[PDB]
Design a protein around this ligand. Structure first.
Ligand SMILES: CCCCCCCCCCCCCCCC(=O)O
Ligand SMILES: CCCCCCCCCCCCCCCC(=O)O
Lengths: 150, 58, 250, 272, 272, 58, 250
């Protein structure tokens, strides 16, 4: 992430496919799911800011259910399920992805019927730092299952 | 001297019997069951208890 | 007497003086989903009167030679005001439907049509090694027309009436909830169709819960000098609509 | 129990009641019974309706599919595979399609047979063959060769069987994603409706793989495996009209237009 | 039972509670559930977690190893032997290595098959073969020949089996020196650290020996035996990260450096 | 722990036993029985009740 | 502590770590209309979570020389998903609003803005014998900008900041519900605004219930090498929305 000259830029994104996507398939949740064919339940994503203490900023964490493609702008992303993450004293923020499906279970494998939807992140505000501070910084993302999961 | 227990069934719509034929417990079939879970030892291994609704720090 | 009925939903009322008793699903009156039978966790949207009102589909003319007409519902109502907008903005949704089919004529006219609502009315293609086109299956409120003879084309629906578009006898469609409009008996028929699926809620663009078919078993016939323009019109209202998965509109 | 309704004696009638007339247009059947049209005697009808129950109709083991494999071939290509698909078989498909939705457990039976291929080899006396049937769920490792590690089967269920024993048998519990299996699907796989259309969009039930577990012998052998399906504990919903057209494809409902009945000389003819 | 947590309805919130923020640095997961982030409906979730139990994960019979032997050979050298080693098989090893320690009973099944070798001999018709599988614990007498007295088996357990019968089966109780089997061993066999390093220092589980118990016949035969393992009553401790590198050796954990995931065009790309 | 029930017999002229041997209900034999019928949902799906002896209209 | 707050509405949550206590109307929390205070007879539509979720308006950059920005609400949200569609399809409607204004900066930056919500903020025209243009008054989510000096044009708004666009002192805007964002004190401010009018419900296109104004009383200032791009962003959610008079969409 960095200081931007423009508003609403995209930070990251990927489809919600825990058993296939390169983002999740080898994470612990993915590794367990790779031994199952079908799965169900809600998921948590934790984002930990690892920049300097003198750095502040805000982010949009959002989930967009299928029936439309991934958002192409913050304006569209914000219309889904979302959390505004205020980077301050607490370093971590959690985005909970609710269970939304026409089914009770989804396929572990990529499948068109049990489409995952999309997870994206957009800047809400700029990353603002004082003089003699590096504006370039990193964020770590962690993933785990919710209590409602099988 | 068989025991009687239940079969796994689907939720939100039955017994079977089980006799042991051997003198060694190693001969018994697998102990498949619902058991119990206690994930806290791996998900919350923390001395000072955190409250879900509260700030983690202070 | 029992020939007269009135239905009020939302901001619309249909009053009929010559009608059949109302047919109701498989004996099930439409309701909202229970906590016991649920998937999606988010609190659902319930537009209530905003979408549960009646909408009228494009009328068709009944010719003495007409083979019949059909509509697919989630697609038929995709542009119908707020019902339309709520499905355009959601991943999942559910609704039952009230289907009221009308066709008046003079006592001197004769003929008879089957009004039937058929779930999962998957269509066969006229070309065997192919699949039907989207426009051959549904044109929103514009009815598709059945063929009197075997039809053709690479993406055409095998619309010959006798097989009801799906390879079954047309005469056996009476299994499905249905009612008849016999011009000597009534002017309208009413069918109440609850949501029916393998799942509690579904995507309203990928799947058509049911198809309405209007089939003239006895063709329209009249003497000369009698009115030649005899329309058939269809009016429908969703019930207990629920939506989940609010998202960027499709 | 499930006894057929009996018959009540009925004498002469002269009244305003009109059981004989109705309005078919209303969408319900007449409830008229013989006691309403003719004079009747009492009949204690002891007949039952057990064979008409859904469970009895469906619980028979039908051949669904069969394929073959050999004990010799090129580069390990000696195994058969089959995508689970219950629509490749005309009789079973027809029965199953009578209900729009169904929920059931499935019992499988396999029948394994084999024969000799024409050969010039003398000394073909061979040991009894053993066969392996393995099920690979969608996304599992796939065999590419008969000697591939993919056959280790650490998790995937499989059955090993020796010829001469009773045919293999196994129970599969209901496995749908939804609460019932759909027989029909009036829809598309994708939101833009650009994928396939119809029932095959839901068919993601895995594949069976089959091979010999002996090594090769000079005498060539060809084996055939027939897979049988027997639904159990079957609950069904929303009956449909039986098909009149013959099936063309396993992946869809395309059909050849077909008449509704055999014809006859006239509407009053007795010779049909 | 083992039911998944259900969902509690949740209305609008405007308060000082902050379930959304935490401190990952503390080493515990967030306990946030959907009721804490969005408005929810009540959901009576009836799903269970039975297949996730350790017992179900592991209790499948995996092929671990196979070898061969012939009915003809030089100077009695017609038997197979195998050192017990569960690390020679990629799929089972991977599953077992998920837990650092485990305690379980082991059920074994053997699958025995055979085939003919190319020969010029006519008159190869032969009687049904019977096989002997013997287990020799560390330090026992060892077969050197198929006709050695070492096969008398006065104490060592063994199984005799005739082809055409159901495959052999037997139960082995937990046998460790310690209170659990170790999957990993960060240490040395010797105090001067001059022996081997790693898990193989603990592998002293004995050897299986296998042979035909018929006499020889002019028609040459080669036999293959597959050994299957099914852990039961399994209790495990201390889970570990699954391996990403492919296994190289059965005796150690040497590995080829490997990336953590398949790549993609960009961090915002949907096509992974 | 077997259950005892009856055999189907001819009408107008007997028990058998049934023990389950498996832990999974999917292993049980078919649920063949007389059950019950309720054809009205398909033969009389009508809001306003018709009387058999009465005119359908008025 | 009391510096941290979290607001959840519908399918959206805003969490803030450095904020002011929430300002609430004139002490009134937004509610639905009572039977005692009602006009329209039709059963109202209550979209609930469909429209009561948060929406984000176009962000602006705060320059050290900026005079300030403003938005009119019913107009600002006219294209905001289903809130937008429900007003496009109804004659009457009512809603309260939650306004959350954000602007973070480093501890080394200084400046301070007034965040104020003003009802009936009728605008004066720069040309005295004239009326302002529609686009000079509102650009949906795009903020209008105040002028540092007297402005001009026949349909221009007299945007000079010191008169707040309406001929009053800017320093007296504090009467209206307001909160400040002082960069040394907080990153965000929250105002809850109940519906306020002379009538229970109104037409959401003809009238703007209130205007949000963001005014830098103390301009942004910083040392060199410090971040130069410091945005201000506004997020709003309707509450207890009600609609009456379903009609052909405007
Ligand atoms: C090798 C032994 C294990 C065999 C496992 C095979 C399981 C295949 C799935 C069978 C159920 C198919 C149900 C389809 C019904 C339908 O969709 O209409
Ligand atoms: C011939 C019949 C008797 C067969 C006896 C074979 C017994 C071999 C030992 C099996 C247990 C091996 C357990 C290893 C587990 C581990 O160390 O991780």
């Amino acid at each position: 992430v960095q200081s931007n000259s423009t508003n609403g830029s995209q930070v990251f994104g990927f489809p919600l496919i825990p058993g296939a996507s390169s983002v999740l398939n080898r994470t612990l949740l993915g590794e367990i799911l790779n031994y199952y064919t079908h799965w169900s339940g809600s998921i948590k994503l934790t984002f930990m800011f690892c920049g300097s203490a003198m750095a502040t900023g805000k982010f949009l964490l959002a989930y967009s259910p299928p029936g439309a493609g991934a958002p192409t702008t913050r304006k569209e992303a914000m219309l889904g399920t979302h959390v505004i993450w205020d980077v301050g004293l607490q370093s971590s923020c959690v985005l909970c992805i609710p269970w939304i499906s026409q089914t009770h279970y989804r396929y572990v494998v990529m499948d068109e019927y049990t489409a995952g939807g999309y997870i994206t992140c957009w800047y809400q505000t700029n990353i603002v730092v004082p003089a003699d501070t590096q504006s370039d910084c990193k964020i770590l993302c962690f993933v785990s299952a919710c209590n409602d999961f099988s | 001297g068989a025991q009687v227990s239940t079969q796994k069934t689907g939720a939100h719509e039955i017994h079977y019997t089980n006799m042991n034929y051997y003198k060694d417990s190693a001969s018994n079939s697998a102990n498949r069951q619902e058991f119990a879970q206690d994930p806290g030892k791996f998900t919350e291994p923390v001395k000072d208890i955190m409250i879900k609704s509260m700030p983690a720090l202070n | 007497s029992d020939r007269v009925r009135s239905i009020t939903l939302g901001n619309s009322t249909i009053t009929t003086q010559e009608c059949a008793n109302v047919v109701v699903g498989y004996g099930t009156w439409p309701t909202y989903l229970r906590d016991e039978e649920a998937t999606a966790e988010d609190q659902p949207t319930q537009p209530d009167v905003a979408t549960c009102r009646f909408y009228t589909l494009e009328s068709v003319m009944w010719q003495q030679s007409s083979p019949g007409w059909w509509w697919k519902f989630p697609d038929a109502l995709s542009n119908m005001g707020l019902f339309g907008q709520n499905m355009q903005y959601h991943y999942l949704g559910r609704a039952g439907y009230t289907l009221h089919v009308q066709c008046n004529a003079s006592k001197f006219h004769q003929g008879c049509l089957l009004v039937v609502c058929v779930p999962e009315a998957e269509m066969g293609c006229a070309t065997i090694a192919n699949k039907p086109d989207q426009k051959s299956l549904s044109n929103g409120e514009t009815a598709n027309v059945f063929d009197s003879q075997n039809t053709s084309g690479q993406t055409a629906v095998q619309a010959n009436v006798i097989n009801a578009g799906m390879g079954i006898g047309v005469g056996n469609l009476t299994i499905f909830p249905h009612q008849w409009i016999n011009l000597r008996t009534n002017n309208s028929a009413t069918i109440v169709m609850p949501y029916v699926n393998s799942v509690p809620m579904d995507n309203m663009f990928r799947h058509n819960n049911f198809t309405l078919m209007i089939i003239p078993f006895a063709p329209l016939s009249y003497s000369t000098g009698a009115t030649t323009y005899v329309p058939i019109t269809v009016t429908v209202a969703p019930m207990c609509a629920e939506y989940n998965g609010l998202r960027l509109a499709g | 129990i499930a006894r057929v309704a009996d018959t009540i004696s009925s004498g002469p009638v002269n009244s305003e009641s009109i059981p004989a007339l109705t309005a078919a247009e209303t969408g319900h059947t007449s409830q008229v019974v013989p006691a309403d049209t003719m004079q009747t005697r009492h009949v204690k009808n002891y007949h039952s309706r057990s064979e008409s129950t859904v469970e009895n109709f469906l619980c028979r083991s039908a051949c669904v599919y069969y394929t073959t494999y050999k004990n010799h071939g090129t580069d390990g290509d000696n195994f058969a595979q089959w995508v689970i698909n219950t629509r490749q078989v005309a009789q079973l498909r027809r029965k199953l399609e009578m209900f729009t939705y169904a929920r059931f457990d499935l019992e499988l039976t396999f029948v394994i047979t084999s024969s000799q291929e024409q050969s010039t080899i003398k000394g073909q006396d061979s040991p009894v063959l053993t066969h392996q049937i393995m099920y690979v769920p969608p996304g599992g490792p796939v065999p590419t060769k008969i000697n591939s590690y993919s056959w280790q089967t650490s998790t995937n269920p499989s059955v090993f069987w020796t010829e001469g024993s009773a045919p293999p048998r196994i129970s599969i519990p209901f496995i749908s994603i939804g609460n019932a299996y759909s027989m029909f699907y009036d829809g598309w796989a994708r939101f833009d409706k650009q994928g396939t259309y119809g029932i095959n969009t839901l068919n993601n039930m895995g594949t069976l793989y089959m091979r010999h577990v002996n090594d090769g012998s000079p005498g060539p052998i060809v084996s055939t495996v027939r897979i049988y399906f027997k639904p159990k504990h079957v609950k069904t919903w929303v009956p449909r009209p039986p098909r009149l057209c013959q099936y063309q494809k396993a992946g869809n409902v395309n059909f050849e237009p077909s008449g509704v009945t055999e014809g006859r000389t006239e509407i009053t003819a007795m010779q049909t």
